[PDB]
């Protein structure tokens, strides 16, 4: 039972955004898909639900005249469209099978969330630069290396190492806001210094709003 | 709305200790006809969706560790972690499904207190490919330290820098309960090429004196 959401987006004020929610691993028509907003410094906010079977909906009064939730049974997908976007609508938008309690099942699954940023600024894709291991990044048999992801907009970017095979010792830092209004972040990992000559370390950088998919090999 | 109010807002306990989080609903959410409390508890880690822990205020979801227990009825509810483990650092939310709209609590952030750990300090000169873009970023890395408080100062040719650097700290690590921090000094290529010595100086409780990590350009 899984819910997969569409990627992060940037939208102008006054425009509309349409977030999809692809469901699998369960009988789609049997349950209701909810949509929940997570805004910075604010508590989780329920926006509405749709019954995946007959398409009936219920919206919160806070979004009643401005949100539209729909579904497509053929594609087992639910959708959340938000109109007349305000810069205050920048948030993480979740779809979720909230508290499924049936005489036979009990489960709760959320989608991974979708960053929506509302801004008049243009999309900017990041440059990816290596943070190579060296004598100034080694300590006690370990070597630190990483990638610098510079000058992108909007948030977020995601970083993995060796396509997810390398997770131990990874630190991907929160983005910082530069004076230009662009973001930067770094991702680092600590690896054995003894095997720098035989192992390969690649940082996988994703910035969906700019369609950026970079695989940077990091070497001494 | 049914207002969910959680206390305390943040909680710091040692590893293996007992943590208690209170949630109070502004309205009675016990239904006498079926003796059920329409309350759920969620755990959320940074960058992750919330995960259900408890429903009906006391029924554990399958696969949730036994150290999570829910209790209470009516308006006063308690989430207990009997013995915190390192991966329990997260924000915990209560949630009511008694009436529409569904609402959530403000969250209680649970953190771990542990022993002092001095940072490991590393420095990265700008890459050759960044330099051909007219900009030079120098990165100073502070790895796996505790407590969170730390000071980073940049020196270029031994001169203290101001206004050209940015810093960010990680969330608490789910395995060793430490923090890491990255600082970036950003200069023009022309300004980078006219100085020799680049250093970041780190102050932290685990260090008797500040540690300086430096390199010479080229």
């Amino acid at each position: 039972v899984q819910l997969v959401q569409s990627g992060a987006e940037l939208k102008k004020p006054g425009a509309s955004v349409k977030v999809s929610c692809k469901a699998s691993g369960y009988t789609f028509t049997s349950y209701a898909i909810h949509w929940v907003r997570q805004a910075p410094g604010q508590r989780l906010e329920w926006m509405g639900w749709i019954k995946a079977g007959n398409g009936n909906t219920r919206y919160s009064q806070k979004f009643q005249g401005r949100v539209t939730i729909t579904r497509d049974t053929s594609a087992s997908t639910a959708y959340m469209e938000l109109n007349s976007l305000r810069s205050e609508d920048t948030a993480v938008y979740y779809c979720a099978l909230l508290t499924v309690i049936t005489p036979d099942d009990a489960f709760d699954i959320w989608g991974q969330g979708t960053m929506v940023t509302v801004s008049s600024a243009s999309t900017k894709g990041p440059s990816v630069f290596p943070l190579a291991p060296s004598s100034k990044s080694t300590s006690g048999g370990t070597a630190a290396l990483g990638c610098l992801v510079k000058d992108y907009f909007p948030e977020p970017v995601t970083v993995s190492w060796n396509s997810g095979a390398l997770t131990s010792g990874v630190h991907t830092f929160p983005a910082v806001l530069q004076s230009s209004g662009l973001y930067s972040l770094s991702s680092v990992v600590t690896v054995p210094s003894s095997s720098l000559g035989t192992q390969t370390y690649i940082c996988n950088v994703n910035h969906k709003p700019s369609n950026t998919k970079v695989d940077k090999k990091v070497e001494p | 709305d049914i207002v969910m109010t959680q206390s305390p807002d943040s909680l710091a306990v040692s590893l293996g200790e007992r943590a208690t989080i209170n949630c109070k609903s502004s309205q009675n959410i016990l239904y006498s006809s079926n003796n059920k409390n329409y309350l759920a508890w969620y755990q959320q880690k940074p960058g992750q969706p919330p995960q259900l822990l408890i429903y009906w205020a006391s029924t554990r979801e399958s696969g949730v560790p036994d150290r999570f227990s829910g209790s209470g009825s009516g308006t006063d509810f308690t989430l207990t972690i009997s013995s915190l483990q390192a991966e329990d650092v997260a924000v915990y939310y209560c949630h009511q499904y008694y009436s529409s709209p569904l609402t959530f609590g403000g969250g209680t952030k649970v953190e771990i207190k542990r022993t002092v750990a001095a940072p490991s300090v590393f420095i990265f000169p700008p890459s050759d490919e960044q330099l051909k873009s007219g900009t030079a970023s120098v990165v100073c890395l502070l790895n796996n330290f505790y407590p969170r408080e730390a000071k980073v100062q940049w020196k270029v040719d031994n001169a203290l820098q101001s206004g050209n650097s940015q810093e960010s700290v990680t969330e608490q690590d789910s395995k060793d309960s430490t923090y890491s921090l990255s600082s970036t000094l950003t200069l023009s290529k022309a300004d980078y090429e006219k100085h020799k010595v680049y250093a970041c100086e780190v102050t932290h409780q685990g260090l008797s004196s500040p540690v300086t990590k430096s390199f010479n350009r080229g």
Partner: peptide
């Protein structure tokens, strides 16, 4: 009394 339509995924009966 609870609103059974607050979350249709919740069956109140046991």
């Amino acid at each position: 009394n609870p609103d059974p339509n607050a979350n249709p995924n919740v069956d109140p009966n046991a």
